[PDB]
Hints:
This protein is an alpha+beta fold. Helices cover about 30% and strands about 25% of the residues. A hairpin with a 5-residue loop joins strand 2 (about 35-40) and strand 3 (about 45).
Amino acid sequence: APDEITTAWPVNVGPLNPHLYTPNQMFAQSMVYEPLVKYQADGSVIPWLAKSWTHSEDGKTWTFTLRDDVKFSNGEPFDAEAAAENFRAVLDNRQRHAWLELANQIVDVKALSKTELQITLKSAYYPFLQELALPRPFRFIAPSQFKNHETMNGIKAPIGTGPWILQESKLNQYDVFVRNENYWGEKPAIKKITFNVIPDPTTRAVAFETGDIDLLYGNEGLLPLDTFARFSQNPAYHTQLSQPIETVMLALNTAKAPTNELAVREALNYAVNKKSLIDNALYGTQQVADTLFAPSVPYANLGLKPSQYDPQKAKALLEKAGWTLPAGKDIREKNGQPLRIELSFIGTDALSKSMAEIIQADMRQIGADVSLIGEEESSIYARQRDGRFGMIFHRTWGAPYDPHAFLSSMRVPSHADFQAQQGLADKPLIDKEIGEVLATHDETQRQALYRDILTRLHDEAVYLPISYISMMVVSKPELGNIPYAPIATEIPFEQIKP
Ligand SMILES: [Cl-]
Ligand SMILES: [Fe+3]
């Protein structure tokens, strides 16, 4: 079956509610559901379900002219009415979308005709179009599949307009998609895609080696990285490594001793040998990160000063702040209190554990005692939400989220970044400026605001950037070159052409 492929994912795709989150998987929501406008690698959007649009002079009122030839996979029409009902369904659950500022900005959505859709905003919101382009929540399910005229309490069949249709799903076993033969756009070359549920990275590698699957596609956690390197030399296989898509880092709790001290956070940022970490734990497959956002990220080329690995500097900073070594001890003390920091991570994640152990070792070398707290996923996310951590592994979100959406979410208290930043004297100013940068259209001011926000976060040593990570691919050669999608969390299956 040349036009059928089998791949893997750590979990099922979920029920494919276009408007909800976990356990829904974003790449799968994007396979079935489509946006008004589609995100492009150059940062722009192109017409998609909307073929054109205009906006008022004040930038608060937008009118979209929709395609008139689009049907949902069940034959029902896509029109402005269906689109408007979707926006209502999403914003009826507005509290759940607080992280996404567009969901707080939309004041009204109404269908003016079958082809005219009008959206009104609280303010001129500059990332409007890019947030419409996201995998979720502003994509469109057939309104017939609402449950009692809503989606927040569940849907019936996951009926979208997209190039893929969910055929069937088996909890903890597999998901099967097929090509939408009545798609309004270009027909995918692939006719059927099977996702085998395989939570363990080694088991995924083994599944490929045995031929049980044709394709592996994911971030640095896709498979063991030593194994990936071996595969990249195996002439029976094909492998790919993308240019970096996002940052992996530690978040340091500015509201909790001892990471509440700037001098301590600064020292920690000099203590880790990132190159060695990446060569030791990531098998040399990723890039060193010096800043929250790579210099290639929009608005983030700011000439921020890296803190290079320098244990001598780290020690000096701690000594100057009164953190000194007692006789016959390797761990520093101040006011009799030991320099002890808890590093929280998902205990079953081998890669995270490996990095955590390297970080612990590096920090012990400069007199800081890091305790490793490996816990189940739910417990770690709970800690993130309420700030019950000293240090935690964290990551940015990739295009088109970085930086505007990641920054926007820093304002949401139930979220790791707010919690990490909560102890900063300048946190209210930062949150004020984040609000301002999203709504200004003085472009000069926009750049200045981004500079100030990112520079304060950098100078305050809120994060310990570790790596800019890449997408990775392992595939049967017969599938050919595997494309990457403009949106980092999407998988462009319809672009695969064996
Ligand atoms: Cl420990
Ligand atoms: Fe999320």
